Amino acid sequence: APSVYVCGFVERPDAPPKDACLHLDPLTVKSQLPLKKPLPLTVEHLPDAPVGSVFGLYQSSAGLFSAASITSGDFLSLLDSIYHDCDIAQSQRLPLPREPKVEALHAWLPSLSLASLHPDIPQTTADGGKLSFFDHVSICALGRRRGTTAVYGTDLAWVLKHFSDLEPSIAAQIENDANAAKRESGCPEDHPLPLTKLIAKAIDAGFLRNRVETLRQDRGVANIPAESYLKA
């Protein structure tokens, strides 16, 4: 029962996209405030591809930060299989110990994507701020917002070190929401895993012009160390 940790910024201001839809109203953000209830961690925005859970989102002079964990046994073993059948997972940008499941995560699903729904149609303004509801964070081939590139690890301590622009105050407390959430029960065999839906999602990621060069800028924007397990 060993689990991975997914961390990174789902949205950064110093990495603002030209699209205004992506813009998140900091008002709705601080409205959803802390840990009401965790958020579903899915693979490529697939509701049938839940692999873990987001146990907190936080703000920084850098941007919104998301901390989650992958607890899907059948998915954790998939990254295992996938690893020795993927030259891209195996080879490393920079020499580092052989880390199966995580090196696969970095080749398969590099970025983070925060999706929100909107009661849309009835429109709102939480006495200052337009309504939206955080429903899930997904691991993807490339998030829409820049600097969304993640980091995978066995311990937040090490996983959070990569983000030097992360106010120690957040990191200090975030290390606790992890132990706190560790009370979660057990939910194996929840949806095998849409291998077919996942392959399709992997196919879409074959037609991304300048993706590796964009994942480069993302690790730099997140100011993550150039000696990371990332592939770009």
Place this chain on the structure above:
Amino acid sequence: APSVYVCGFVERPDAPPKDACLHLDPLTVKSQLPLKKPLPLTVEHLPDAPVGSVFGLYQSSAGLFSAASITSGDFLSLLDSIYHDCDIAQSQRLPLPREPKVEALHAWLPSLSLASLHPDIPQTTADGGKLSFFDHVSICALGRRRGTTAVYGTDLAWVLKHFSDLEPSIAAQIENDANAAKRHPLPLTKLIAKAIDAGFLRNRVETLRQDRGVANIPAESYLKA
């Protein structure tokens, strides 16, 4: 359930290699000659991913041409599944009549790859040529050779038209080897990994573009690039 045809040039002299091992020797070419028995059609070179069979290879003033057919029911239904879940497959570059299985093939495994078995040490420069054994052609993300951009379809007539520079003489006869010939689940995990690798290639889409231009296939085709 019917079968799909894969056609295209595995090697085009008009679109050369930058290195030496990716060169073909007319020696081995006229050596392998027409058909011996069918040739295994695999996916990303996976011996356990056989989806059809190559029923002939031919020469042209333009290059080497490969004609194959996909008959694996389990794979034919996979391009089915895959299609309503693949935005790149669903969306067309130009307006053309929707084509599930085919649209998927072009986004998933667009190119062709000709693999040959070679000796450890120079074994038989049969002073008629260098030695190599053609063992299979695979459908992949992007061939290492150029003009490799393949064409998928239901009927060869239409499938073979996409090739201008191809001589009618071969196409006319090739349409017969098909009727003549008419006489491993699929390690999805291994296939995904192969698809992951494709996610880390530089200029793939832009390279697939130059390929359909070099292989002389119209813009009005089902090439996702």
Place this chain on the structure above:
Amino acid sequence: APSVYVCGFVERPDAPPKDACLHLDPLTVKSQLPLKKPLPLTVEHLPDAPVGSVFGLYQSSAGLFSAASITSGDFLSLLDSIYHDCDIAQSQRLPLPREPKVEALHAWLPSLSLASLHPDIPQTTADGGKLSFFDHVSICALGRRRGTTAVYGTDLAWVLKHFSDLEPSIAAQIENDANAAKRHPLPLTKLIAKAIDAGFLRNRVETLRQDRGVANIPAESYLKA
């Protein structure tokens, strides 16, 4: 007319390569496994110079061992001719009972060479190993691998003794595959050319010496070096 046995190590871990392609992968090793059908025994790798057949290959704490047999009458009489015209064959390094055909083999084609067919592009690192197909073993002037110095003889019992470090378990069983198995002119011009090439090698004799020392064969053997 009888047949001659060729034995020796085609590869010895205790006597390593200076390069990468001359490495063997235990993967392909346990893949090819015992026998499938006999293996063609050729001369200097000439497909048109088949003189016998390899009836088994085995592993040892010391390396890979090859057991073959020569049965070509036209070649058996050639070592006959060749002997009374080859001063190097006639003259022995140490006093031993005259042996025409054999003395010739040791001066003409002393070493063993294991050739394998490899894919054009990485084809099947069967995640159990790298892919290679053993197509034949050839007798040559001086193998590219070390400890390759082979041993020729009339009876395996004696032929297999020359190998100290070889386990009795394999030799005992190998003597049976021989009885079990017991159930192209010869392009002299191409052979001469091959012999000419051997005339232009640096340290051949001195290299063949280190080979019999590394393959653990006695000084009291029929090795011309």
Place this chain on the structure above:
Amino acid sequence: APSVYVCGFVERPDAPPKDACLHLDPLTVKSQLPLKKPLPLTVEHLPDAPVGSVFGLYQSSAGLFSAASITSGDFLSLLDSIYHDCDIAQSQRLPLPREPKVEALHAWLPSLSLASLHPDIPQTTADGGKLSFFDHVSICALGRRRGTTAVYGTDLAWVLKHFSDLEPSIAAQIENDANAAKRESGCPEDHPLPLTKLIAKAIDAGFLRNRVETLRQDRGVANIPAESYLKA
């Protein structure tokens, strides 16, 4: 009916071997004087391997020089076959036009060897000089006397240029003994060619320690140009 030319020194004083047998008494030499009758040109001292004829031997401040020609049609075509089946013949030390038959000669039979018989037993002294009879010159893998390395060509003009230590007086006249001998009739199918005997002779040439390094010194000793068709 195109023929090759074999030239070089069969014996040089500046390249004297330690063996005294090899020593040729200059007295018997000038005794055999010029062109009595040509000498048989054989392959590896094989009486059954006649491939041409020696049409003159000459002396120099350098040493005894031998000029011969290969007229064996069935042997001339053998060097042809042999050529494209011999990587050593094909490859060149230094880039030069593709010359089949001759490039094969240089890889197969580099040196020259002058053999003489001796009435031996009755002993003689041609009023100054011990009796010996020149019976043939053979082309071999390596002659016993140093600097015996030959040169093959279609015209003596070019073939003789290689030996700058060759008194023009000799060369000038030697170019004539060639036209003179060109009266010789025709003797095809004289002895197929002991392919078996030739292979054996080729096998012996596999156990020559430091042969390529000795063929080097020979081209230097003969002061032949380093841009020659020779292989060493």
